[PDB]
Ligand binder design. Structure first.
Ligand SMILES: CC(=O)N[C@@H]1[C@@H](O)[C@H](O)[C@@H](CO)O[C@H]1O
Ligand SMILES: *[C@@H]1O[C@H](CO)[C@@H](O)[C@H](O)[C@H]1NC(C)=O
Lengths: 49, 48
């Protein structure tokens, strides 16, 4: 009827890959993966920071 | 004799001769989009 719906560029199964990467960074490496380097740190030491 | 969608678009009909029931779907239409590199790089294109 002239109306159309276009797909998003990032599919839902690919947004869920970014949210996984964001929290898998956050859980293993604190904030440092924002400042370039994903420096690992054990999680009870990240919570002390 | 005929049927409507949620938005009152007509989307089914009886054939009045054989009382079987037909769906109406719009004839397909959509934007022709030209994927191009910059003309500086090439004159080749792909069409979506
Ligand atoms: C609703 C109805 O009466 N439909 C009839 C159909 O069954 C028959 O095959 C046709 C023959 O021309 O005429 C019409
Ligand atoms: C692109 O086109 C312009 C205009 O002719 C020209 O100045 C420029 O050098 C070109 N660059 C390349 C990489 O083709």
């Amino acid at each position: 009827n002239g109306l159309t719906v276009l797909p998003p560029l990032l599919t839902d199964e690919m947004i869920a890959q970014y949210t996984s990467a964001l929290l898998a960074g956050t859980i293993t490496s604190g904030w440092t993966f924002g400042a370039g380097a994903a420096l690992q740190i054990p999680f009870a030491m990240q919570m002390a920071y | 004799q005929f049927g409507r969608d949620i938005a009152d678009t007509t989307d089914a009909v009886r054939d009045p001769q054989t009382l079987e029931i037909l769906d109406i779907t719009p004839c397909s239409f959509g934007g022709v989009s030209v994927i191009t590199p910059g003309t500086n790089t090439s004159n080749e294109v792909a069409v979506l």
